[PDB]
Each structure stands twice: as structure tokens, then as C-alpha cells.
């Protein structure tokens with residue numbers, strides 16, 4: 271697994287860099303970014319084929335680097351060298367990572383059956399992030415009254431999400447949270463019955 | 466840019482601590498980084514460490530070039546220092562909260578610049594030094610940063626938590642409060 275060389279040009283100063291590989295279908299698009307603090311200075315974009323000065327402070331490098339055939343050919347060769355190579359490895363491993371969602375259902379408050387409450391479907395510790403969470407009342411999907419936080423990244427290669435339903439439970443009402451995910455052969459369902 | 470997946474080497478060097486960082490992310494999750502003191506590659510999961518390798522020297526060489534670029538840009542910009550962008554802070558559990566059941570508190574600190582922070586966990590007003598962990602300073606596409614702090618704990622009806630965050634963009638230290646329910 272490989273990388274490529276960046277080109278060379280109280281108080282705090284910072285310099286940042288990005289080497290980005292965008293995989294789409296079977297193609298690779300490569301971006302190289304040079305950044306002073308939060309300001310992008312010079313960019314290489316494989317779709318352009320050469321360096322572009324984003325700011326005036328990046329103009330000398332952009333112009334000089336573009337006059338070096340060898341520097342350009344090294345960068346133009348990146349999509350088919352570094353990007354493809356690292357991607358094939360991530361396809362074989364990272365993209366095979368499957369972690370099953372745990373599903374928990376609980377009312378936001380416990381108590382009577384007179385008035386509104388929130389029924390919370392808490393779905394945790396799954397990967398990858400693409401997921402479908404549905405609420406059912408007595409066998410019928412609920413579209414209204416569904417309040418979701420969106421996908422929450424835990425930062426440890428797992429996601430969670432909370433999808434809650436505005437409800438007014440009557441005795442003998444059946445609520446189901448249905449979860450579908452690529453790691454699951456069949457959907458996970460958790461049932462909560464009003465009592 | 467249209468893509469199924471985004472694979473990114475992100476790196477920075479700065480004058481204040483931490484002075485350098487080199488990492489690779491896949492779809493916005495950090496897969497590995499180079500420990501610049503130990504001069505070795507550190508994998509986020511054992512899954513990756515067993516299947517993949519990376520020559521840490523590749524990262525070390527790019528850091529050195531980045532440092533030269535910093536030196537050059539401090540002068541060319543007439544010592545231009547960026548504005549301090551304060552962080553948003555959120556606290557949330559990893560697992561559904563059950564009294565007596567081991568869980569992990571997550572403090573997420575987002576959208577800040579520069580990557581210079583002080584973070585402290587507080588339990589009932591007192592600092593916690595055991596069972597704590599943290600992510601690297603993670604890059605954002607807007608060139609600001611985010612970061613995760615972690616605390617393992619056992620939820621109880623008695624205990625109260627705060628995530629205490631210091632950053633130059635804040636007028637005063639920020640506390641985000643959390644309780645088990």
C-alpha cells in the first residue's frame with residue numbers, strides 16, 4: 271500500500287496537504303492540494319492534466335511545475351498507479367467490512383397511554399453506513415411523525431442512528447422498527463407493544 | 466466530484482503542538498497514520514494491520530517537504546496567521562444507555578481551526594484520566610478539523626459528566642454536559 275511525494279515550494283502557522291483518489295465505476299480521478307492554513311494555493315487535478323494556481327501565492331509553483339515534463343508525468347500517472355493500487359486493496363478488504371446493527375426500542379418516557387410520546391429506535395455499531403430504518407404501526411408503515419437524527423459517525427469505524435416516532439399509544443397497538451443493512455441476510459425487527 | 470468512494474492522504478504541519486500529522490482515510494474514516502516519534506505505521510483496526518502494510522518512511526518524507534513549504538509560506542505571506550475558528554461540541558453514548566452496562570461516552574469536537582486543543586473529561590466535577598482515548602485531528606474538506614474523545618464508563622443514576630474543551634477561538638472553556646437517562 272503506497273503514497274506519492276508532495277512537491278516542494280501564541281502565534282501559529284500551518285501548512286496542509288491532500289492527496290485525493292476518487293473512485294467511480296472503474297475510473298480514478300486524482301487531486302493534489304497545497305494549503306497554507308485554510309487557504310488552497312495550488313492544485314493538481316488529473317482531469318485537467320496540469321497544475322493550477324488557486325491563489326496568487328501558489329502561482330510561482332504552478333507555473334514552474336508545469337514547465338517540468340517529469341513532474342507532470344509523475345502526477346498524471348497517479349490515477350493508474352497509486353489510486354488504482356490502493357483501491358484494489360481496499361476493495362478486497364475495507365469494502366468487505368460488514369458489521370451488524372444492534373437494534374433497541376424504547377419509549378422516550380415511560381408512563382400512561384393518554385398522550386404523546388416518542389418511540390425511539392436506536393440502531394448502533396454498524397458498518398458500512400448505508401442503512402434503512404422503518405417504523406410500522408399495526409403492520410402499516412409510518413411516514414409522518416418520523417424524526418430521525420441522520421447518520422452518526424462514531425469515529426471508530428462504526429455508525430449509529432436514532433429514528434423516533436411521534437405516537438399516541440392505545441392498548442394493544444403493535445409498533446415495529448424494521449432495519450435493513452447489507453450485513454443482514456434478512457431484516458431485523460424489534461417489536462414494542464403498548465400496555 | 467462523482468465517486469463511489471473517496472480515498473485520501475491528509476497531512477499537516479504547524480508551529481504549535483501537534484507539529485505534524487500524516488494519515489490515510491477511506492470514506493472519511495482514518496485507516497492508518499504514521500507515528501512521527503516512533504517512526505512507525507499505526508492501523509486503526511487489527512483487521513487492517515493484519516492485511517495491509519505501509520512503509521512509514523513515505524509519510525516521514527512528505528512531512529519534511531511540508532515543513533519546508535511551511536517555512537517558505539510564513540515568509541511569502543508576511544507571517545499571515547489564520548483566524549481561530551471555534552469548535553462545535555456534542556456528547557453522546559456509543560451504545561444504548563443501560564444502567565450497570567459498560568458503554569463509551571463520545572465527545573465530538575467539530576469545525577475548528579487551528580488543530581490545537583485542550584480536552585478534559587469530568588465526572589461529578591473531577592478529571593478522569595483512566596479509560597480515556599482520542600482520535601487524531603481529523604481533516605475536513607473545508608480544511609478545518611474535527612476530533613473524537615472517548616471515555617469508557619458504567620452508566621449510573623448517580624454520576625454526571627462533562628466534556629471540557631479549550632480552543633483559542635473560544636472566549637472561555639466550553640463544557641458539554643451529559644447524564645444517563
Ligand SMILES: *[C@@H]1O[C@H](CO)[C@@H](O)[C@H](O)[C@H]1NC(C)=O
Nearest residue numbers: 280581582583630631632633
Ligand atoms: C491548553 O492549556 C494551556 C494551559 O491552560 C494553555 O496555555 C493553552 O493555550 C491551552 N490551549 C488551548 C487551545 O486553549
